[PDB]
């Protein structure tokens, strides 16, 4: 408790170095794709203006602006969207309120109005503590159930005499393998089958959603197709349990980082001490 | 610790009721705006096809699809974007990596490639514990500095004799007022002046960003204008300190919810006991 001011500066420098490395890698990987996309869109527009004589550049840019505002407003520009197929229905509003309290915030659906934004601010402010409580309760229940399960597994295991060492390592590898299998390996398959995504896109969606980053480029609910009535409830249940499992996994990764930090500190101190 | 299975069910029912209420309110507020937007875009397209004879509906829908894919790819359709003005530069990649580790995830900038997505998954998985450590350290430092400040304020206050009661209430109101003034009241003014947003949009942006929901509809960095060189670093510093202040405020709101829960439980038990 009460981390010293010297440790905070070192952690800050480590974080800034991590950001510099991530920025370099992202910049190196992502510039060519954006260059090709820019040439593709410019060539598409010049092709359209070449093919159609009547159109002129000012009107075409005005139409492109209208389309961009249409996407900003949340309405689909392409096709004739039916009035009955409202995107703000109770199932979608339920999904939106769940993302707000969860703090995933995909962003495909946004308020866009003064009253929606005010109610979003008050609703989020009240909502986050309540979900934090629910998540802590679900995490504790999951932890006790898994702990009793591996307690009886270990108890049965005592028939074949085994060293006390590596029993925790094996229990942890079993936890990681079962958790990834049940949370990332299977929902990725269901999402891929019901939506046409690729395996990497499905894994990326599961990781971004459960980690609560929620970029919004890949959203399970939002597509120009019709799903089953119970698809969204099942997705929310997978999200609720996955959030607990990922929070636990992140805590374990943090614990590993601390040990590596303590080990590095003692090793550096020992090398300093003999070095003289 | 180890929340009972009965409490978890009650918290789950409360959360589901909260989502039903939020969904109803959001649906009631947001349907008309979407209806008007849908009519506006349909009327704009039929007006364009009426004004231009040469254009036909299949080609116009194809052009709208090309524009929609251009927005999905992250490139601006409207205007001629210069090749030099890359959106994936080190300043932007730094902003993106900061949102990934922070878990705000605005979503304006996304990987879009197999290597970007794989590196995003590994980078986030390592990054979140490190930021959690940095955030805890900054929160502890802020708490100790504020605690010593109000310690000396209280010590000076003892000249005028005051009741021991309400001293904590006054310190907490002072903390809330100073924190909102310095974190939400002023950055909203700077964002509004440098970007043209309204006051409600600025307050909404600050709340969504610091709460880590990060919808992405309002992003300080992304606009079709040029800012000062140091604008993004100052924004990141405001985000780093704001995250600690909001985490503290959310913890206080959670503590208030717990007390109201304990008070409600004892009041219901007492009413049950006498009721007979
Ligand atoms: C993080 C918190 C975890 C919570 C996860 C559990 C989810 C709780 C459950 C249920 C439903 C919540 C809102 C449903 C309101 C439906 C009202 C309705 O009319 O359905 C319409 C939706 O359209 C549909 O009918 C089909 C699509 C969604 C399903 C409709 C209602 C749910 C029925 C089946 C699934 C619920 C539970 C299944 C359990 C596996 C909305 O249009 P409108 O109202 O304007 O007419
Ligand atoms: C490229 C260079 C990477 C080599 C890395 C690391 C040495 C770690 C220096 C951080 C100094 C703080 C020591 C520490 O224990 O950090 C603990 C956790 O801080 C961290 O984030 C550890 C990061 C280690 C990264 C390993 C690579 C805080 O615990 P406490 O304050 O109670 O002791
Ligand atoms: C949550 C963590 C909190 C961290 C907050 C502190 C931020 C740490 C600081 C600094 C800069 C990090 C990346 C900058 C790399 C700039 C390289 C560069 O050339 O600048 C170009 C950006 O364009 C510009 O020159 C102007 C726009 C951004 C500023 C450029 C560099 C920073 C100079 C001033 C501000 C830094 C610190 C000011 C302190 C108030 C990138 O284009 P390219 O590389 O392809 O040629
Ligand atoms: C509309 C009806 C709203 C009236 C509300 C609420 C009574 C609260 C029922 C929840 C039963 C759990 C009691 C409780 O203490 O919850 C505590 C926190 O749970 C909560 O989220 C409190 C929610 C109260 C909402 C107040 C409205 C958990 O602490 P612990 O397990 O250590 O005792
Ligand atoms: K988020
Ligand atoms: K987000
Ligand atoms: K988050
Ligand atoms: K987002």
Numbering used by the authors:
A (entry chain A), B (entry chain B): 40 to 315
Original authors' sentences:
Tandem pore domain (K2P) potassium channels modulate resting membrane potentials and shape cellular excitability. For the mechanosensitive subfamily of K2Ps (including the TREK1, TREK2, and TRAAK channels), diverse stimuli control channel activity, including lipids, pH, heat, membrane tension, post-translational modification, and an array of pharmacologically active agents including volatile anesthetics, antidepressants, and neuroprotective agents. Two key regions of the mechanosensitive K2P channel structure appear to control channel function, the conformationally flexible TM4 helix, and the selectivity filter. Overall, this cryo-EM structure exhibits K2P architectural features consistent with prior crystallographic studies: a dimeric channel assembly with each subunit composed of four transmembrane helices, a domain-swapped cap located above the selectivity filter, and an extended membrane facing TM2/TM3 loop within each subunit.
In the POPA structure, both TM4 are in the “up” conformation (d) and the membrane facing fenestration is closed (e). There are two POPA binding sites where the lipid density interacts directly with the core of the protein. At the upper site (d, e), the cryo-EM density for a lipid acyl tail can be seen inserting itself underneath TM4 to sit behind the selectivity filter pore helices. We find that the presence of a lipid tail in the upper binding site forces an inward reorientation of the W275 sidechain toward the core of the protein, moving it closer to the G137 residue. Our structures suggest that a lipid bound at this upper site may similarly “bypass” the influence of the TM4 helix position to directly modulate the TREK1 selectivity filter. The POPA density located at the lower binding site is positioned between the TM4 and TM1 helices, such that this binding site is only constituted when TM4 approaches TM1 in the “up” state and is broken in the TM4 “down” state. An array of basic residues from both TM4 and TM1 surround the negatively charged headgroup of the PA lipid, suggesting a clear electrostatic basis for the binding of PA and other anionic lipids at this site. The S300 residue, a protein kinase C phosphorylation target in the proximal C-terminus of TREK144, lies directly in the center of the lower POPA binding site, 4.8 Å away from the well-resolved POPA headgroup. In this location, phosphorylation of S300 would be predicted to create both electrostatic and steric clashes with the headgroup of a bound anionic lipid and would disfavor the anionic lipid bound TM4 “up” state.
